[PDB]
Symmetry: C3
Subunit: 98 residues, 3 copies
């Protein structure tokens, strides 16, 4: 499993969400964050998604395309290993908790 | 060491905190985040806790029980490897920084 | 690559930013978070920085020094493995996405 973090332009959130939803991924966590530029703050949105290793390329692909504008500040995708997930309500683990 | 992230219902925060505190874990980081549902935002709370590997099962156990309601949307526990921690004020490392 | 997370006193943000900037690191993500104390909330700032393995010691060093006050609550540095990064706008990967 992988924990995919996406930092994007706040206005691209719906496009990213619908795009992920189009590939069966609806459960995401959104966080309001800030970046910097010339030194002012620049509002951004952080999306965290927990996935199976097999979904990595598809996610990177759909997310890139959906978050894209072509103007600087489009954002980045970060990938890290997710060792375990537990669905609190049922106690289901990993893929059953995704 | 492990970095345990817990996404829960905002109103279950105190129960989770007191539960963790009951097992000697008081230092947590809380973040306000959002999830989605049928497509509206749903407020959530993210708790990040840095722990020793030996505390993983106990944490998963106490946290699950404390965050539980039985209604959907209870949340999830995510587990990742924590390679190093440094307590800024003293320079203490890892377990001494926990 | 590594994902370095820094939790600090909100007022030390500029000092940390200028310090990182002094070593060529300008791209950071800032998040407003909360800690606890005796049980009240205590405002904090979370900075996430993506780096090459070779920058770890220098970052830990400059950040520690810059965030320091000597009073309790100074914060902590957490280190985790960053497996991949993709710059959305160009598709550049890893070091080219840093």
């Amino acid at each position: 499993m992988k924990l995919v973090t996406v930092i994007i332009k706040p206005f691209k959130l719906e496009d990213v969400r619908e795009a992920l939803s189009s590939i069966g991924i609806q459960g995401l966590t959104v966080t309001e964050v800030k970046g910097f530029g010339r030194v002012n703050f620049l509002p951004k949105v952080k999306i965290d998604v927990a996935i199976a290793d097999d979904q990595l390329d598809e996610v990177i692909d759909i997310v890139s395309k959906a978050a894209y504008t072509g103007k600087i500040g489009d954002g980045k995708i970060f990938v890290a290993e997710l060792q375990r997930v537990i669905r609190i309500r049922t106690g289901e683990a990993d893929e059953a908790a995704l």
